[PDB]
Amino acid sequence: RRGFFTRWFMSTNHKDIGVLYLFTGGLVGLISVAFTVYMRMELMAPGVQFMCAEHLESGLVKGFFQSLWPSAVENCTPNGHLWNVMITGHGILMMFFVVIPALFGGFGNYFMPLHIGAPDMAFPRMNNLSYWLYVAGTSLAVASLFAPGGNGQLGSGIGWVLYPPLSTSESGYSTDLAIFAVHLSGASSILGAINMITTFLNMRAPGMTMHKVPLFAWSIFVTAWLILLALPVLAGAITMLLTDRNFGTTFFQPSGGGDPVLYQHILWFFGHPEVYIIVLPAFGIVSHVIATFAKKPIFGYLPMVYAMVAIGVLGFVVWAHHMYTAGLSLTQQSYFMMATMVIAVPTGIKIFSWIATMWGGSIELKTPMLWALGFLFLFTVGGVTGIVLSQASVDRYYHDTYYVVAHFHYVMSLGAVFGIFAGIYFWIGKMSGRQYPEWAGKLHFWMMFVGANLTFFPQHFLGRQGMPRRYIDYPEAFATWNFVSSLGAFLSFASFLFFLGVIFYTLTRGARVTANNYWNEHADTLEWTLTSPPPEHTF
Amino acid sequence: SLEIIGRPQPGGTGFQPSASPVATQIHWLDGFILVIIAAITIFVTLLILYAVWRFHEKRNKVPARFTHNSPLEIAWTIVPIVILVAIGAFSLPVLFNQQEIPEADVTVKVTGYQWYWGYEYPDEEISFESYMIGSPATGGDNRMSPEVEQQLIEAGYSRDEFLLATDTAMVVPVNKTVVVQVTGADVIHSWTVPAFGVKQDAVPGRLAQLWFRAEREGIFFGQCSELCGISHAYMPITVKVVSEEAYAAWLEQHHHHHH
Ligand code: HEA
Ligand code: HEA
Ligand SMILES: CCCCCCCCCCO[C@@H]1O[C@H](CO)[C@@H](O[C@H]2O[C@H](CO)[C@@H](O)[C@H](O)[C@H]2O)[C@H](O)[C@H]1O
Ligand SMILES: CCCCCCCCCCO[C@@H]1O[C@H](CO)[C@@H](O[C@H]2O[C@H](CO)[C@@H](O)[C@H](O)[C@H]2O)[C@H](O)[C@H]1O
Ligand SMILES: CCCCCCCCCCCCC
Ligand SMILES: CCCCCCCCCCCCC
Ligand SMILES: [Ca+2]
Ligand SMILES: [Cu+2]
Ligand SMILES: [Cu+2]
Ligand SMILES: [Cu+2]
Ligand SMILES: [Mg+2]
Ligand SMILES: [O-]
């Protein structure tokens, strides 16, 4: 009856929009991960072998294929701009167009209404628009890569956080396109957030009291508030960049009386909440998953809710720990350090509660549980290096080095992302009507576990040895751990391609789901009382 | 000649050597925090592995139902607080020592440009620019070549210092308090020397200060630490720390005698 476009892209139903966000997030994820393989190809060995200026004189296509095969150093003129563009593209895609659309826009849109017994979102057409603004933003971010940019080449080589005067002086209009992309991502997130909040407050089922709402729906609720405060502040920061670039203002230009550091305060006021926006929905998913496979209800439900609330609020008063070397007074540094340290307390409550949930349980090591258990261990590794970094005295050394990179990839790529995979394996039977093959989920898990640890753990070493961020090339002494890191990245990439094969097989040939609840009775939230997939109109 | 001290070493896993009291404090503080965070991480990991081993479904077929344990829930809020307070107690004094600028024996004003550093010694009326050996300024294109290698050797280095070595160095006397004032000329750069435990952004329109006192003579390298465009990877920092007498000799070499 309905064509493929009408069935999916035109749908205003939360479950369909959820699925659209998941697939799209996965596709943009694949693109951004491919950038990192190329990045790690260049970082595998000292000397520049792939990112040669000589490749610019060929076509876009033949230049692309030339770029993939290594040249001798003496035939390769280093092109730092390509490196800077790849790095910026990878970061912007991840932070605006991958993990939050997957967790918040994807699982958030899909499961939050199911969890509270709501038939749909408050504003279903607004929900559909949110998705289109997301795709439009992604399209512009991607377009920026092929638009006239810095140094008379294509693309913006300015870092995902767009610091001026670099970002305000970058030639071409590629940077303006990236700014518009981020505006459109922001709008997408705000529309989503308005829906989540209105639905959560006004559309819970009869009897569904606030203290009976499942933890994932709480995580999405808290996340939406952060978005409402954080994203308009960013829209301001980047609009100021656009006006300095195009409309004669001098907000961040010292010649006109501006201050580059003012941008940083406004940016990081969004930039820290951003990372709690990323990880909270993953906290939610981990809670549902551990409770299910430990066959035991969540330990400390109320502390779990209040911890996420405390994390969200604290996330707004710590931003200048990204600015310890930017010219902050000793007083500001001391405050922001101590404020930041407080965040470990509510986060520790959650980690310990998850372990206490497992304690005395009957633990089933199915694929979704492996991801959640990995999350506990790996998010802890990343969280503690965050605490190290909060110490401004130690951050003097670590700032703008690969130790920071190691920190954030542990919490994001071995944390938030493990949360995404946990949710995918937990819920694919429910969303699709077909179950994944257990052995392949487990192989995926172990390949990713070994690969991602090999990729990022050695970056701590590189950072301690003083390797800076955003470098196309490095002193020879950094060779060993860069080589190991790159091997890890390649193994990680294989695991991801395998994963995509697992999803393809699942959705085409996977064993049909014959039960509303194909796990166990401790998967005790409303989606498990519905069919697999749930009916078009639910409740 | 001068010993090369402030540099990364092959396969290294620790900090670069310390050559200042500030760097030594960082090494101590990070070592202290590392023991603590390793303990915490090992604790969390062992608890997870134990729980899985102990309460695996083939071993424990009947799950418990508890969702509370006040004594424990209090302990695991309070203990993290104590640890954080302990870390803060040692961390704040180090921070204060880093950021309280003492009286200068030597004052250097550093400016970051795309893509090189400028040094001015206002007490000595000395001013000069410092480019990577291998940079276009020195005839190169930011890669190793037989010319670059010969240039590194002539300057007192080897091919191993490529990307670290500059054509000119910031020279200072050993055991003297150096105050460095850092600013940017165009975009933000960042001036750093790992061996000294210092790093300060070079922001256009702002003059920021840092200090160090080098405790041994030698050569110490840093690298630009705020992305600043195409040659971010290719504008390093060389500091040579020398005797009071060798420092004077270098000053006189810069003195113009016009009549
Ligand atoms: C998922 C995203 C995410 C998350 C959740 C976090 C969480 C945290 N982050 Fe991180 N961070 C990033 C992503 C994230 N970060 C990114 C992308 C950057 C780089 C930005 C850029 O420049 O591009 C960054 C950079 C960054 C900096 C700036 C570093 C620099 O540029 O020099 C700092 C400074 O303090 C910091 C700190 C912290 C802290 C303290 C936490 C805390 O929330 C973590 C708390 C968790 C734990 C502590 C572990 C579990 C707790 C226990 C087991 C209890 C017991 C523990 C103790 C008593 C310590 N991070
Ligand atoms: C979500 C956040 C995220 C993730 C997942 C990743 C993933 C990876 N990152 Fe990235 N990284 C950033 C965010 C992220 N990165 C940011 C913000 C920067 C800063 C850029 C800047 O400096 O401006 C950065 C920078 C950065 C650098 C430093 C560049 C530099 O300073 O010069 C490096 C270096 O190796 C790197 C490597 C990798 C690798 C090898 C992977 C991966 O290949 C690791 C393996 C992981 C997988 C194979 C799985 C990925 C799965 C998903 C993403 C989920 C997809 C969605 C669904 C399935 C629904 N990244
Ligand atoms: C005694 C016999 C005398 C015969 C003399 C005539 C033969 C000359 C052929 C030289 O060999 C060339 O070497 C290049 C450099 O290795 C190759 O470039 C290729 O490989 C390079 C690797 O450095 C890349 O940089 C280049 O872009 C890519 O085109 C190129 O294809 C290859 O033909
Ligand atoms: C499933 C996903 C798989 C991802 C794809 C992985 C691609 C990895 C292949 C990279 O190829 C290597 O690149 C090195 C450069 O980094 C070369 O180093 C050598 O050659 C260089 C000259 O090109 C020299 O400068 C080096 O010192 C020397 O070690 C090496 O020969 C070459 O084989
Ligand atoms: C239990 C049936 C086994 C079917 C195997 C599905 C795994 C798909 C692997 C795809 C790999 C693509 C690179
Ligand atoms: C919780 C993991 C923190 C990562 C820090 C790695 C440092 C280990 C290197 C020890 C050698 C230093 C002398
Ligand atoms: Ca290379
Ligand atoms: Cu932050
Ligand atoms: Cu610079
Ligand atoms: Cu730079
Ligand atoms: Mg910086
Ligand atoms: O952050």
**Any idea what the CATH number is for the domain that residue B182 is in?**
2.60.40.420
What is the SS3 assignment for A429-456? HHHHCECCCHHHHHHHHHHHHHHHHHHH
Instruction: Determine how many CB atoms are found less than 10 A away from the CB of residue A477.
Output: 22
Residue of B nearest to A324 (CA): B200
Give residue A22's domain range.
Answer: 1-539
Identity at A234, one-letter amino acid code: L
A335, A469, A518, A524: which one is catalytic? Answer: A469
Going by C-alpha positions, the residue among A279, A475, A470 that lies closest to residue B237 is A475
Of A81, A325, A468, which is closest to B200 when you measure between CB atoms?
Answer: A325
Residue with tokens 């002193």: A475
Same domain, B223 and B233: yes
Helices A344-358 and A301-314 cross at an angle (nearest 10°) of 150
Q: Classify strands B177-184 and B116-121 as parallel, antiparallel or unpaired.
A: unpaired
Task: List ligand 6's pocket residues with C-beta within 6 A.
Answer: A 381, 384-385, 460; B 13-14, 37-38, 41
Contact at 8 Å (CB) between A182 and A139? no
Residue of A nearest to B81 (CA): A345
Same domain, B119 and B239: yes
Q: Looking at the CA of residue A494, tell me the nearest atom of ligand 4.
A: 1
A268, A276, A398, A519: which one is catalytic? Answer: A276
A470 Cβ under 8 Å from any chain B Cβ: yes
Same domain, B51 and B20: yes
Q: List the determination method.
A: X-ray
Helices A367-390 and A344-358 cross at an angle (nearest 10°) of 160
Give B220's Cβ-side CA count (13 Å radius).
Answer: 30
B228 is in an annotated binding site: yes
Give residue B87's domain range.
Answer: 7-102
- C-alpha A439 to ligand 5 mean position (Å): 9
Contact at 8 Å (CB) between A260 and A165? yes
Considering Cα of A423, then A426, then A431, then A437, what sign does the dihedral take? positive
Same domain, B76 and B112: no
* A276 catalytically annotated: yes
* A274 catalytically annotated: yes
Q: Per the domain annotation, does B160 fall within a domain?
A: yes
Helix (H, G, I), strand (E, B) or coil at A187: helix
Residue A512 gets which letter from DSSP? B
Please tell me the distance from the alpha carbon of residue A92 to that of residue A374, in angstroms, as a whole number: 26
Going by C-alpha positions, the residue among A226, A113, A245, A232 that lies closest to residue A182 is A232
Same domain, B118 and B245: yes
Residue ending a domain, choose from B86, B102, B118: B102
Burial of A70 (0-12, 13-18, 19+ CB in 10 A): middle
Triad A294, A300, A306: Cα angle to 5°: 130
Query: Residue A233 is part of a domain; what is its CATH number?
Result: 1.20.210.10
Please tell me the distance from the alpha carbon of residue A63 to that of residue B98, in angstroms, as a whole number: 49
Residue A107 gets which letter from DSSP? I
Of A344, A345, A470, which is closest to B232 when you measure between CB atoms?
Answer: A470
Same domain, B215 and B120: yes
Please tell me the distance from the alpha carbon of residue A20 to that of residue A141, in angstroms, as a whole number: 19
Domains in chain B, number? 2
Copy the structure tokens of residue B243. 């005797």
Burial of B259 (0-12, 13-18, 19+ CB in 10 A): exposed
Please tell me the distance from the alpha carbon of residue B208 to that of residue A141, in angstroms, as a whole number: 35
Query: Residue B70 is part of a domain; what is its CATH number?
Result: 1.10.287.90
Residue of B nearest to A261 (CA): B203
Question: Smallest CA–CA separation between A401 and chain B, in Å?
Answer: 8
Size of chain B, expressed as the number of residues it contains = 259
CA distances from A346 to A283, A296, A343, B56 (A): 12, 22, 6, 28
Please tell me the distance from the alpha carbon of residue A55 to that of residue A67, in angstroms, as a whole number: 7
A residues 315-344 lying closer than 8 A (beta carbon) to B: 325-327, 330, 333-334, 337-338, 341-342, 344
Residue ending a domain, choose from B50, B81, B102: B102
Same domain, B97 and B108: no
Q: Per the domain annotation, does B2 fall within a domain?
A: no
Q: What are phi and psi of A426, to 5 degrees?
A: -60, -40
Please tell me the distance from the alpha carbon of residue A237 to that of residue A273, in angstroms, as a whole number: 15
Same domain, B31 and B135: no
Please tell me the distance from the alpha carbon of residue B200 to that of residue B188, in angstroms, as a whole number: 10
Please tell me the distance from the alpha carbon of residue B63 to that of residue A362, in angstroms, as a whole number: 5
Buried b (16+ CB within 10 A) or exposed e, B183-199: bbebbbbbbbbbbbbbb
Copy the structure tokens of residue A235. 């829209």
Give A454's Cβ-side CA count (13 Å radius).
Answer: 18
A461 contacts B12? CB cut-off 8 A:
yes
Q: Looking at the CA of residue A502, tell me the nearest atom of ligand 5.
A: 8
Copy the structure tokens of residue B148. 């670059």
Helices (H), A343-366: 344-358
Mutate which of A27, A43, A44, A417 for ligand 2 pocket (most atoms within 8 A of beta carbon): A417
Helix (H, G, I), strand (E, B) or coil at A369: helix
CA distances from A372 to A410, A425, B259 (A): 14, 11, 79
A303 to chain B: which residues are within 8 Å by CB? 73
Domains in chain A, number? 1
Run of H or E residues at A458:
helix A438-464
Resolution in angstroms comes to 2.2
Please tell me the distance from the alpha carbon of residue B8 to that of residue A533, in angstroms, as a whole number: 56
Q: Per the domain annotation, does B1 fall within a domain?
A: no
Helix (H, G, I), strand (E, B) or coil at B117: strand
Residue ending a domain, choose from B70, B102, B134: B102
Residue with tokens 């290096």: A385
Buried b (16+ CB within 10 A) or exposed e, A243-270: ebbeeebebbbbeeebbbbebbbbbbbb
Bond before A533 cis per omega within 30 degrees = yes
Same domain, B110 and B88: no
Cβ of A183 less than 6 Å from ligand 1: no
Q: Classify strands B208-213 and B106-113 as parallel, antiparallel or unpaired.
A: unpaired
B21 to chain A: which residues are within 8 Å by CB? none
Copy the structure tokens of residue A292. 């299910």
* A132 catalytically annotated: no
Spatial CB neighbours of A156, under 8 Å, sequence gap ≥ 6: A85, A88, A144, A149, A150, A167, A170, A174, A175, A178
Going by C-alpha positions, the residue among B181, B189, B196, B207 that lies closest to residue B238 is B196
Same domain, B36 and B17: yes
- C-alpha A396 to ligand 9 mean position (Å): 17
Going by C-alpha positions, the residue among A118, A144, A130 that lies closest to residue A208 is A118
* A538 catalytically annotated: no
A403 Cβ under 8 Å from any chain B Cβ: no
Size of chain A, expressed as the number of residues it contains = 539
* Helix and strand element counts for chain A (H, E): 20, 0
- C-alpha B247 to ligand 4 mean position (Å): 45
Please tell me the distance from the alpha carbon of residue B171 to that of residue B203, in angstroms, as a whole number: 23
Same domain, B178 and B89: no
Q: Looking at the CA of residue A49, tell me the nearest atom of ligand 4.
A: 23
Same domain, B222 and B242: yes
